[PDB]
Every structure is written in structure tokens, then in C-alpha cells.
């Protein structure tokens, strides 16, 4: 027979349309509510092997989505079942993502539109960090935009909560987080007491990707990457980055010794506005605790100069 289930609707109430969860991961469908035509995204909960019941990392993600309610964060509407059995996370659908738009050459951003994009992105980082969450997977692909031009950060499948680390016991968070290209130095050097700054770095790589239309630092592995970073920001040294020595992997990873900060320069050709350059610079800072934060980033002259941030309709 059957069990009562007032608060978990069967996903059949939505009509699947098309796989959109590319990278071949998640198994994400666009879908349509069979009564109102309202479009949504269905992210099925993987379950590959999972020999420990409902996946703990899914509980984590569902906790975080439920806590994050904000105009620049994706919106979990409900969670649905099947009747093996399956579980779907249901989101408000969003037509575009920033990877799709940055690659498509039919699409162009006025300086002011870009400004708005960054503003929304940084605003959402302010919100999540305030709520003690790290995204840990910043990349244009995870930045969506709706028809009406509202940007939303998405895919919190890697996200986790973070704590004020006192009582003389540094945290032990997972190190191998964030895509390689949008990953920050702290993590490559094997940091485990990291914080909000690891997302800000992502946000940098994305600022530039708004002009270069292309992920600015593509690396084969963690070692090719970390060099490629230093071939843009300068050499990692206690001089530029106090106490960077203490990382086991510092000198213990043959880091290129001779390199001076070539960031504004290697980017001038793509981004003209000197304010945008300056912001990109304060975001791509090597030392976490010297890197700019969401609050200060938002009060940066970039967002308060002509041309002013404009809404989005060029898409």
C-alpha cells in the first residue's frame, strides 16, 4: 500500500524537456509545470553507489539552499520524489549562464552592463559569506542570468559552512575544492584554514573573463596552474605574502623564483577602463588576507563612475 506524503510532491507534476546539466554532471533537466507552464530546473540527486543512505553532501547542499534566500542566489522551490526511488531538487529556471554568453560571439556587453553583472555577482557573495557559507566552485558556468536580467549564483553542490576559527584550533576544510582554473593559490599550496577570500578570487577570474571572453588562466594540473598564476601576479614570497613560507609545498614545489607583478599590463589590451583594471587587480591579490572583500569591492570607484551600471536587455 501507500504512505501519506503531504510535503513532498511527485516530480511527475513537472514535464521534463531537455538535459541542460552539461559537463555531463548532475543530470539536470529543464522542465515545465504541467498546469501553469512555469519553467524550472530539476537536479536529480546522483546516488551513484551511496552505501550510506541519503547522501550526506546532498543534505548539506539542501541545507544551504534552504538558508540562502536572496535575489542573486539561485532559488530552491521544493524537493520532489518519484514513487529504487529518486530525489529531485527543483529550481526556478533561468534562461542563460555566463559561460554560454561569454563564448557566444553574437553577444556583447557595454561597459555599464558588465558593471551590473559584477555588482550582482559581488552582492550575492556578500550575502552568502554573511550567512557563513563558502561557495567553493566559482566559475562563469555557475553564474546564471534570468530573462529579466537578474544574475544568480548557482550550484552549491560543493558549498559548505564556515566558522570563526578561534580557541587556538585552525580549521580542517577540504582542500581540493573549486575548478582548477578558478582555484586560488591558497588551495594549491594546500591550505585548510581558508575563507570567503577563495570565492573572491573566483570573482576575479570572472571579471576578466568578461572582457577576454575566455578563462584567463588555463592549466593542465595544479603545478602548471600555480606557475601560470605567478606568471601574472608575481612570485610568491614572504615579502609580498607574509608567512607564506610555512606552507609545506612552498619551496617544496619548485615555484618559479623570478617573476614581477604583470597583471594590469597583460590585461590593459582587453579591458580599457582603468577602474575595472584596478578592481580586477585588488581581487587577484596573492595573499588572501590582503585580497579585497565583497563589501569593499562594491564601494570601489568602478561601480560609482560614468558609465553607471545599467540594467540588462542586451540578451
Amino acid at each position: 500500500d501507500s504512505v501519506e506524503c503531504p510535503f513532498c510532491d511527485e516530480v511527475s507534476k513537472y514535464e521534463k524537456l531537455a538535459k541542460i546539466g552539461q559537463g555531463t554532471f548532475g543530470e539536470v533537466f529543464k522542465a515545465r509545470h504541467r498546469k501553469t507552464g512555469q519553467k524550472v530546473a530539476l537536479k536529480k540527486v546522483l546516488m551513484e553507489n551511496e552505501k550510506e543512505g541519503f547522501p550526506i553532501t546532498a543534505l548539506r547542499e539542501i541545507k544551504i539552499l534552504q538558508l540562502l534566500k536572496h535575489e542573486n542566489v539561485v532559488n530552491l522551490i521544493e524537493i520532489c520524489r518519484t514513487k529504487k526511488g529518486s530525489i529531485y531538487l527543483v529550481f526556478d529556471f533561468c534562461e542563460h549562464d555566463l559561460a554560454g554568453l561569454l563564448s557566444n560571439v553574437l553577444v556583447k556587453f557595454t561597459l555599464s552592463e558588465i558593471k551590473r553583472v559584477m555588482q550582482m555577482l559581488l552582492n550575492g557573495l556578500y550575502y552568502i559569506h554573511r550567512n557563513k557559507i563558502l561557495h567553493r566552485d566559482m566559475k562563469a558556468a555557475n553564474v546564471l542570468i534570468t530573462r529579466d536580467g537578474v544574475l544568480k549564483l548557482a550550484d552549491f553542490g560543493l558549498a559548505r559552512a564556515f566558522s570563526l576559527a578561534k580557541n587556538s584550533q585552525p580549521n580542517r576544510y577540504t582542500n581540493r575544492v573549486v575548478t582548477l582554473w578558478y582555484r586560488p593559490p591558497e588551495l594549491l599550496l594546500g591550505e585548510r584554514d581558508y575563507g570567503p577570500p577563495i570565492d573572491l578570487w573566483g570573482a576575479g577570474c570572472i571579471m576578466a573573463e568578461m572582457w577576454t571572453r575566455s578563462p584567463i588562466m588555463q592549466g593542465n594540473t595544479e603545478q602548471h596552474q600555480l606557475a601560470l598564476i605567478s606568471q601574472l601576479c608575481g612570485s610568491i614570497t614572504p615579502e609580498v605574502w607574509p608567512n607564506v613560507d610555512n606552507y609545506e609545498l612552498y619551496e617544496k614545489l619548485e615555484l618559479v623564483k623570478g617573476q614581477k607583478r604583470k597583471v594590469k599590463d597583460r590585461l590593459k589590451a582587453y579591458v580599457r577602463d582603468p577602474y575595472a583594471l584596478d578592481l580586477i587587480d585588488k581581487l587577484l591579490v596573492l595573499d588572501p588576507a590582503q585580497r579585497i572583500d565583497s563589501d569593499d569591492a562594491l564601494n570601489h570607484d568602478f561601480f560609482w563612475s560614468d558609465p553607471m551600471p545599467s540594467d540588462l536587455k542586451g540578451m
Binding site: 503531504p6 550510506e52 543534505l59 526511488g85
Partner: protein
């Protein structure tokens, strides 16, 4: 919204279990049992009281939707604890929770052979029930942990170490013994527990410098009249529970 897991006296009266043959009195003890089983398993698995509490709330909320006649507490509690532990950051392995459930519920019998089909199915069963719990709760597992509320109210009245320990005790027992957490907000429950703790300890909380009673600093909706009724109900249940009041009883 945020009134979904809060219920009226009448709603509690007409529970799923009631509609299947179970008296109010019988059901209330069914919860008390499940809560004990939770506490016992949680202690042996070495999880926090916070985690155990979460489980107890999952349990309470669960039985406002399902009936004890379809889902016996002995089956639901291990599943609820298995869930609570992952949710709270203290995952226990599925085998381990099953071993411990078994010893608790059959201190004599010997654990089957992991190789057995008998055992393999009780593993599938727990996982299934975790699934039914998840669905029944509408996937809403973030609980407002009630201890921290109590702590802040004892701080807010410069309570003795003893007066706070007693409060904490009322607090924890209310979760095991009453359905308060299905009826009143964690802030309020804590007032209830501090009030009763004062009465028991013969401690008088001084009125404000204004004339405002201490509880008004915690939940506007709280009237003395209410505290008195709740602390009464709680105390009656305490008096019925063997050895319990002994734990906080001044003997000198």
C-alpha cells in the same frame, strides 16, 4: 511557512495515531519510549545531545503525519538518529547504527551475519525508512537547537551554575517527555524551563528596574499565566517519571 510544524491542542488530539485506535495516553508514551531509545543509542554511538535532540524532533514531527500503528517507534528511532547524525556533522556508519540499535533492542540476541540476507534486509529497511522520514518532513531538517536558547536566558538573569544546570535538565526532559516542541517556540519552551527551575530551586527572579518581568526580554508573547500552566504540565510528567526528579533534588 513557519507555522507548518506547530500544532494546536485540538490538532494534537486528532493525531494520525488517534485515527488508528491509539489513545492519547498510549501515544504520548510511544513518543517517550522512542525518545528514550534515541537517548540510549545516541549515548552509545557517542553523539552529542544536540544530535539526539534533533532526532527526537524529527521523531515528534514525523508522528504528526504518520501513525505508530504503521511505523513502530523502535524502527523509526534508529533511522531518525542515523539521519540526525549526518545532518549535524557527526555521521555514524549505517552498520554501526544498526549494531547499536540491535543491542539496545535485544540485549540478549546475537548480531546476525552481515553476510546473511536477514541482516542485509535490515540494512535496506533502515535506509528505506530514512527515506520515508526525509519525505515526511518535506526535507526540512534544520532545527532550531533549544539548548542555546536556554543558555541565553540563564545568562539573562545572572543565574547560578546550579540554577542553569537545573534549567538545562528541565529543557532536555521536556523534549523527551512532553510534546511542547510541537506546540511552542524554542524561545518559549526555554522560559517554561527556567520558570520551573526557579520554582524548584526556590529562586525569585527580581522584577525589572521598570516593572517588566524577565521573560518579556525573550518572547513578547509569554504571559505568566502560560508559564504556570506549562510548568505545571511539565512538573506532573516529571513526578510520574521514576528517579528523574531525584537527579535535581537538594539533599544536604
Amino acid at each position: 511557512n513557519n507555522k507548518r510544524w506547530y500544532f494546536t491542542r485540538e490538532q494534537l488530539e486528532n493525531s494520525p495515531s488517534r485515527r488508528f485506535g491509539v489513545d492519547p495516553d498510549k501515544e504520548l508514551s510511544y513518543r517517550q519510549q522512542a525518545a528514550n531509545l534515541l537517548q540510549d543509542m545516541g549515548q552509545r554511538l557517542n553523539v552529542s545531545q544536540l544530535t539526539i535532540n534533533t532526532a527526537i524532533v524529527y521523531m515528534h514531527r514525523f508522528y504528526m503525519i504518520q501513525s505508530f500503528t504503521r511505523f513502530p517507534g523502535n524502527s523509526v528511532a534508529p533511522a531518525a538518529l542515523f539521519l540526525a547524525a549526518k545532518v549535524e556533522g557527526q555521521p555514524k556508519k549505517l552498520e554501526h547504527v544498526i549494531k547499536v540499535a540491535h543491542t539496545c533492542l535485544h540485549p540478549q540476541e546475537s548480531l546476525p551475519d552481515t553476510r546473511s540476507e536477514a541482516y542485509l534486509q535490515q540494512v535496506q529497511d533502515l535506509v528505506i525508512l530514512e527515506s520515508i522520514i526525509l519525505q515526511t518532513l518535506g526535507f526540512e531538517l534544520t532545527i532550531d537547537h533549544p539548548h542555546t536558547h536556554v543558555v541565553k536566558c540563564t545568562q539573562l538573569v545572572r543565574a547560578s551554575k546550579d540554577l542553569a544546570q537545573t534549567s538545562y535538565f528541565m529543557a532536555t526532559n521536556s523534549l523527551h517527555l512532553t510534546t511542547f516542541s510541537l506546540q511552542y517556540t524554542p524561545p518559549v519552551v526555554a522560559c517554561v524551563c527556567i520558570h520551573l527551575a526557579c520554582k524548584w530551586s526556590n529562586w525569585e527572579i527580581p522584577v525589572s528596574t521598570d516593572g517588566k518581568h524577565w521573560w518579556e526580554y525573550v518572547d513578547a508573547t509569554v504571559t505568566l499565566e502560560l508559564l504556570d500552566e506549562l510548568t505545571h504540565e511539565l512538573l506532573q510528567i516529571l513526578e510520574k517519571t521514576p528517579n528523574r526528579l531525584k537527579r535535581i533534588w537538594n539533599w544536604r
